Design a protein around this nucleic acid. Structure first.
Lengths: 171, 65, 459, 8, 121, 54
RNA sequence: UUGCCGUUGCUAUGGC
């Protein structure tokens, strides 16, 4: 990541406030990281636009970049052009995070509840348990989010608190 | 139940052995002791337990393999 | 009396039989192990006599007969012992059926000339509802929700059933006494299709939670869970190898699973009318792939909800051959029922000509293992028998059987006779409603029963 | 090609 | 001319139903004419899907009058049995509604289909 | 019609069931240029079978 | 051969 040019602009502070509030981010370092990746992508796209159309490097690298962005899901299938790559925003990347997706799919009632579920090893993408909220979900992995087989919400035995309470009640 | 699958089998007659990659799927279990794996591989490949050697085992994150 | 001698005795006796029936002896012995080589070696499509098939319909009390599974003993070449469980059961064919009424029924079908004859049954009900409400506690002996599928173990010792109750109950074939209950341990893990690996105890179960579960019945234990479908796994199939294939329903994708290599091959139809119409210069877009059966270790067929019967090859991702609107188009809605207007011409307009017409769905589809013939089922009122070309690049319509009336939930084929002369019996479960749900409008003349048809080879 | 087994 | 109008083609209908099944999984789908009538009244409907083979069609022709007045797109699919299967319920469904939610995971697909219906109308 | 009891626990269920069918009948009448009574009769017989059941 | 009700036989198929 890379620190912003003027961190103390009031508009910047309010923008960070809104982003952290909607997506439940822990600190500004996460926003800075996503902004840094977005800046790299958009700078590359700009330099590609600068070159003449039909240039072999432009064709190859631009097609590769749009294919990558489509795979990650940020870029829609019907906007496969570098111009729309210039139109990307930080929110688009923030939505692709595993926290936001877990919230949206209905597995959690709030973004913070989704984060708590993720870091407690309850959410699995395909076969693999993921405990990293900043995990970026691709299109194919968008659906495979599910409760993990080991999770008490996934069909295993109840957690320690549940069976402990049952034990005291039975006694 | 626990499954053992062998892959990438290479016969090495120079050292007089067969080398392979072992994948152990062990749902609801910590892991498989090397001795038990040796017994099972031994009977599967129809060789003594003394002739079987296993090493380099890492459990995949999240468990189950 | 050494064991090597015993095999030698049986081996010599087996040859003596083959000599009596009769190059030819050498040819047959290769055919005994042709199954191991995953290629089609039963080219009997031409020899079938569909027109002379003796068809019959047997009514059953259970409402909405949902699935049927047939068990056929096979003489094992390795040991020359029949697959029959016990001494009493030599050369006996059994058929098991399950229905939405929570009842499992076994039938005897050994006599091809006679109808199925019920032997024993077990029925569930509200008595078995779990009180705990936890998934791992869903271990009651009997069913309490609709049973959707049933399969008979190749060893003839167990028959296993599953349904919307999210349980996998395995029964004793002799008594239909439940011996073990395996919860799927998921909130939405409703079992939708079961298939045994041929001549083995491994079971593959397709669940509505988008996963395939694998079991080893002999150990009564779960082995693996497979992931990757984009919608419910409605059907599954298997053969001698471990390459089970599945169809994901609305995701419109058929996947072959190499269990040892832990890899999957994805196949997608990808057919679009505008090109098909352009190529011609009524085509309906596929909505789901509902049924599947493996003709061969390197080929399988699928039936969609647009009446398309597709042939696939492992090498090619796209279909190699397609048979559009296999079962025809559904009858048009009546003009007296389309609209309440008095004038007939006004009602005729609401039909909108031919735009409202839709095709029959391929409710059932079964292919005899390692053969060039497969049977397709729907509620058009006839079972169509197809033949795959010698080059395995196309198939044609061999014939039809018009006895079946209603929704064909599942098809099975059982054979008898010497190797040269062989009679095939086609058993199809018929119901008034589709197995998964009650969507289909009631079909006139439909009845709950087991459709049967005996076909003989001559040449 | 390798071999396969399940135990317990 | 026909009362059931406009009717989506085969290419569009599969796209529409694919949105229907996902909306069902995400609890964003209302099923049945009576439900769809309420959503239009409350102004929480993205667009309405209707069955052109309803017997008779007239029992769902109140929706277009509501749908247009609120400027909510609407479309007819040829089959009600197929539409019911997509919805995730075990009976035919003649009319359905997609509830409005800008925080939905399937927002882009709903807006994609919503554009096609607008052009089709 | 709940102020004049036009449609009138098991008594309430038939009232609600008749309400749905009545709503269905109005739609057929209103949006048809020349409404016929064929659908109204079958709608009524459906209520009669419900009436007998309860 | 059917859970219930019919028709058709000395067996086959109509409705719920």
């Amino acid at each position: 990541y890379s620190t912003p040019k003027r961190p103390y602009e009031s508009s910047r502070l309010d923008a960070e406030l809104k982003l952290a509030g909607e997506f439940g981010l822990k600190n500004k370092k996460e926003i800075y990281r996503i902004s840094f990746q977005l800046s790299k992508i958009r700078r590359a796209a700009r330099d590609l636009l600068t070159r003449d159309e039909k240039d072999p490097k432009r064709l190859f690298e631009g097609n590769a970049l749009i294919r990558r962005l489509v795979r990650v899901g940020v870029l829609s299938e019907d906007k496969k052009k570098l111009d729309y790559v210039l139109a990307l925003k930080v929110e688009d990347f923030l939505e692709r995070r595993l926290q936001t997706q877990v919230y949206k799919l209905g597995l959690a009632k709030s973004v913070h509840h989704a984060r708590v579920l993720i870091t407690q090893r309850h959410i699995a993408v395909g076969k693999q348990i993921v405990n990293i909220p900043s995990f970026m979900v691709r299109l194919d992995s968008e659906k495979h989010i599910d409760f993990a087989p080991t999770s008490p919400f996934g069909g295993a035995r109840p957690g320690r608190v549940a069976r402990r309470n049952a034990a005291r009640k039975a006694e | 139940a626990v499954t053992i699958r062998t892959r990438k089998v290479i016969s090495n007659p120079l050292l007089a052995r067969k080398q392979f990659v072992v994948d152990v799927l062990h749902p609801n279990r910590a892991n498989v002791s090397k001795d038990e794996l040796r017994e099972k591989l031994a009977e599967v490949y129809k060789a003594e337990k003394d002739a079987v050697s296993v090493f380099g085992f890492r459990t995949q994150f999240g468990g189950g393999k | 009396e050494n064991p090597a001698d015993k095999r030698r005795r049986l081996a010599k006796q087996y040859l003596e039989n083959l000599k009596s029936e009769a190059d030819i002896i050498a040819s047959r012995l290769k055919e005994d192990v042709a199954e191991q080589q995953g290629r089609v070696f039963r080219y009997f499509g031409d020899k079938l006599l569909i027109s002379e098939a003796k068809q019959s319909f047997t009514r059953v009390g259970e409402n909405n007969l949902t699935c049927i599974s047939c068990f056929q003993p096979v003489l094992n070449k390795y040991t020359f012992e029949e697959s029959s469980n016990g001494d009493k059961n030599k050369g006996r064919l059994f058929a098991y059926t399950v229905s939405k009424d929570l009842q499992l029924t076994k039938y005897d079908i050994t006599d091809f000339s006679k109808r199925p004859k019920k032997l024993k049954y077990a029925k569930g009900g509200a008595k078995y509802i779990p009180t705990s409400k936890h998934e791992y506690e869903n271990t009651t002996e009997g069913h309490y929700d609709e049973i959707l599928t049933v399969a008979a173990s190749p060893d003839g010792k167990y028959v296993v059933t599953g349904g919307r109750d999210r349980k996998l109950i395995v029964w004793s074939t002799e008594s239909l006494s439940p011996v073990k209950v395996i919860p799927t341990k998921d909130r939405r893990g409703e079992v939708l299709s079961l298939a045994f690996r041929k001549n083995s105890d491994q079971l593959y179960a397709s669940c509505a939670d988008f996963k395939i579960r694998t079991y080893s019945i002999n150990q009564f234990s779960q082995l693996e869970i497979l992931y990757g479908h984009h919608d419910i796994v409605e059907d599954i199939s298997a053969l001698a190898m471990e390459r089970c294939v599945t169809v994901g329903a609305r995701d419109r994708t058929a996947m072959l699973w190499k269990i040892p290599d832990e890899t999957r091959l994805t196949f997608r139809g990808g057919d679009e009318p505008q090109k098909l119409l352009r190529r011609w210069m009524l085509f309906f877009c596929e909505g789901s792939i509902d049924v599947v059966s493996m003709v061969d270790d390197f080929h399988f067929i699928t039936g969609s909800d647009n009446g398309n019967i597709c042939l696939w090859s492992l090498a090619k991702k796209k279909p190699i051959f397609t048979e559009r609107i296999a079962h025809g188009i559904l009858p048009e809605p009546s003009f007296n029922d389309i609209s309440g207007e008095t004038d007939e011409e006004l009602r005729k307009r609401q039909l909108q000509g031919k735009k409202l017409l839709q095709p029959f769905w391929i409710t059932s589809l079964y292919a005899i293992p390692y053969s060039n013939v497969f049977i397709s089922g729907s509620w058009s009122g006839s079972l169509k028998v197809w033949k795959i070309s010698d080059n395995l690049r196309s198939f044609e319509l061999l014939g039809e059987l018009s006895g079946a009336k209603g929704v064909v939930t599942k098809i099975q084929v059982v054979e008898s006779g010497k190797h040269g002369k062989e009679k095939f019996r086609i058993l199809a479960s018929i119901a008034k409603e589709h197995r998964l749900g009650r969507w289909i409008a009631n079909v006139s003349g439909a009845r709950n029963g087991i459709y049967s048809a005996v076909i003989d080879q001559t040449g | 090609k390798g071999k396969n087994l399940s135990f317990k | 001319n026909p009362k059931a109008f406009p009717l989506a083609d085969a290419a569009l209908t599969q796209q529409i139903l694919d949105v229907v099944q996902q909306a069902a999984n995400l609890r964003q789908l209302k099923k049945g004419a009576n439900e769809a009538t309420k959503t239009l009244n409350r102004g929480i409907s993205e667009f309405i899907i209707m069955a052109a083979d309803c017997e008779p069609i007239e029992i769902l022709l109140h929706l277009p009058l509501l749908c247009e007045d609120k400027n909510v797109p609407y479309v007819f699919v040829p089959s009600r049995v197929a539409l019911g299967r997509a919805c995730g319920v075990s009976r035919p469904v003649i009319a359905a509604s997609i509830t409005t939610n800008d925080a939905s995971a399937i927002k882009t697909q709903i807006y994609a289909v919503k554009d096609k219906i607008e052009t089709l109308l | 019609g709940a102020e004049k009891a036009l449609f009138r626990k098991n008594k309430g269920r038939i009232s609600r069931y008749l309400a749905n069918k009545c709503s269905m009948a109005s739609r057929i009448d209103n949006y048809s240029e020349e409404p016929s009574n064929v659908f109204g009769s079958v709608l009524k017989k459906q209520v009669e079978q419900r009436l007998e059941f309860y």
